Amino acid sequence: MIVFVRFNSSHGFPVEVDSDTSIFQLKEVVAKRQGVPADQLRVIFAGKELRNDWTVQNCDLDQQDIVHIVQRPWRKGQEMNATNSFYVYCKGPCQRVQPGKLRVQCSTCRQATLTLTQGPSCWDDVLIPNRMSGECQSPHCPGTSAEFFFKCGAHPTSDKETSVALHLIATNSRNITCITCTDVRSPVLVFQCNSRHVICLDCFHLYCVTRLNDRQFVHDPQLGYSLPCVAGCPNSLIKELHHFRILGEEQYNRYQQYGAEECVLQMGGVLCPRPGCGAGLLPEPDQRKVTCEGNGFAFCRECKEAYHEGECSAVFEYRVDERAAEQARWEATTKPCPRCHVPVEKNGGCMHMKCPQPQCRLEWCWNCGCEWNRVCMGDHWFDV
Ligand SMILES: [Cl-]
Ligand SMILES: [Zn+2]
Ligand SMILES: [Zn+2]
Ligand SMILES: [Zn+2]
Ligand SMILES: [Zn+2]
Ligand SMILES: [Zn+2]
Ligand SMILES: [Zn+2]
Ligand SMILES: [Zn+2]
Ligand SMILES: [Zn+2]
């Protein structure tokens, strides 16, 4: 039996397997072929992950079936009861999703001198430019508008060292199960669909890589190329395209070239079948021999394998769980003063609390129950 393996390419290379061949054995074959360790590979078939112990017969794999192989090690080590509200993509030295550090400055002079009228309570307050008001303490500054910025919280960063905020990603304090794997993971990406479907960062990676290989990225004229909710929900396309950077440097570079690759195929061209190389090749209208040479292997246009003569090789070329989708819905009193002991009422999502008593007037954090500081401000200014 022969199955096609899609590993960082739109074309699936043929691999010969038996009924008793396990997924781990298939991973081992592709591991030595690509020079990547087997414990880092993941087998995806029709949007579902195939486990190491399962055989070809168990998976119900037949002739000419296409399987995806994605390089991402599964990590169990995660924090469920994390205090952080924000997540950012650190483009060095982390090169992954990390808890964010929210900071404020004057939009005019760019100094940490702007005194806010009120603390932020939602994403709109920190994302929409010139939304929040205040007054700058710097001499002769007309600044009245707040400018919020996010940094990585996993290591020290300079005042200039900013990271892009990922507003779809959230800490799973609500213990919501993932739409694809049903596992309770943290953090989770929340799609902007009516149902607000929750997906773990592992599943989201598998979803994006397989759709890059299947070339099933939805095109929007006033946005570009993006993916909707895995459930196929209407009006759920990821607007903030910086969310595709979480896939890593290699996979995000593939996503960036997607637009240029689609233009070549639209004209009548072909792409390089070799993994890693996805060059937009434009050969002659009726030419079978195609070579990757705009500034390196010869291949057949029909079977997409190494160039040969005569006939092409005889062996030549999703629905979500209803209960899992229902369970994956993200949306579907008083605390005493740590010094005064008088109960204080919470107004909005803002964690910055102040005692209403005239003698105490203590500024404290709602969650931590300690005096208000830069750590609580950066880590969890508002509840999300
Ligand atoms: Cl976030
Ligand atoms: Zn970092
Ligand atoms: Zn200013
Ligand atoms: Zn998942
Ligand atoms: Zn959805
Ligand atoms: Zn090439
Ligand atoms: Zn051929
Ligand atoms: Zn008090
Ligand atoms: Zn706190």
Author numbering: 1 to 83, 144 to 353, 355 to 356, 361 to 382, 391 to 405, 414 to 465
Q: What does the published report state?
A:
Parkin is an RBR-type ubiquitin ligase which is characterized by RING1, inBetweenRING (IBR) and RING2 domains. Parkin has an N-terminal ubiquitin-like domain (Ubl) that shares 65% sequence similarity with ubiquitin, and a zinc-chelating RING0 domain immediately N-terminal to the RBR domains (Hristova et al, 2009). The RING1 domain recruits E2 enzymes, which carry charged ubiquitin and pass it to a catalytic cysteine in the parkin RING2 domain (Wenzel et al, 2011). Wild-type parkin exists in an autoinhibited state (Chaugule et al, 2011); subsequently, autoinhibition has been demonstrated to be common to RBR ligases (Smit et al, 2012; Stieglitz et al, 2012; Duda et al, 2013).
